[PDB]
Amino acid sequence: AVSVAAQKLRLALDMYEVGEQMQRMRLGRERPNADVVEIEAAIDAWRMTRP
């Protein structure tokens, strides 16, 4: 008994996680010599920026 609105919001949360992982993979490609910590730092900077 999850509402339709709740189902759609749960899907959007899944979408965020996929988009974060896609951004992480792309940054790794664009910055091949970047260590894990540097990539995560880039991921953290990414969220903080406006649309």
């Binding site: 709740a6 919001l9 959007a12 949360l13």
Partner: protein, 184 residues
């Protein structure tokens, strides 16, 4: 999931502070219409004036939020919004961005999103009004199209009334929102 964690934490914090609040933005749009990739958590908070908004922000800075940005404006409510970070994801708190924050919080519907995650979510009609005003940030046009496609006849009339109220309070930034609404 960084957003889920942020939503859970800000929901508990705003509720612990007995605030009048509602989820807006991309997650509310997703709930009311078509889900989309969203990374900002945007929340309307109804407070009486800048002093009250500032007091809430000051309290949240003592609960492991930090101030990323503040949106000032030349109006009676000098504080339209603040952007806060976790000390995970950005949270924008909207106090006086559209001028109907009290109505948005009052009309929002509590939704149990996941276990132990409950949030008031703005109505379709109020999201339509917000997204019409904010139209510029290209995702607003897409959100607006989705909301209108999902809207009932009553949602449409309710959006009309919300937009009239934005204009009556002087938050319409010199635009004819009523005319823009006739076209949607």
């Amino acid at each position: 999931n960084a957003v889920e964690s942020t939503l859970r934490r800000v929901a508990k914090d705003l509720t612990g502070l007995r605030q009048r609040w509602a989820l807006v933005g991309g997650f509310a749009v997703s709930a009311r219409s078509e889900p989309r990739f969203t990374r900002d958590v945007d929340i309307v908070v109804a407070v009486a004036n800048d002093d009250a908004a500032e007091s809430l922000v000051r309290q949240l800075l003592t609960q492991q939020y930090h101030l990323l940005a503040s949106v000032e404006q030349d109006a009676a409510r000098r504080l339209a919004a603040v952007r806060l970070g976790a000390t995970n994801v950005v949270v924008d708190l909207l106090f006086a961005s559209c001028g109907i924050e009290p109505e948005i919080a009052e009309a929002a519907e509590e939704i149990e999103i996941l276990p132990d995650l409950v949030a008031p979510v703005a109505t379709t009609a109020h999201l339509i009004a917000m997204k019409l005003l904010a139209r510029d940030r290209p995702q607003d046009r897409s959100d607006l199209r989705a909301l209108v496609d999902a809207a009932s006849p009553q949602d449409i009339q309710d959006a009309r009334k919300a937009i009239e109220l934005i204009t009556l309070r002087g938050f319409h930034r010199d635009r004819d929102l009523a005319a823009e609404w006739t076209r949607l």
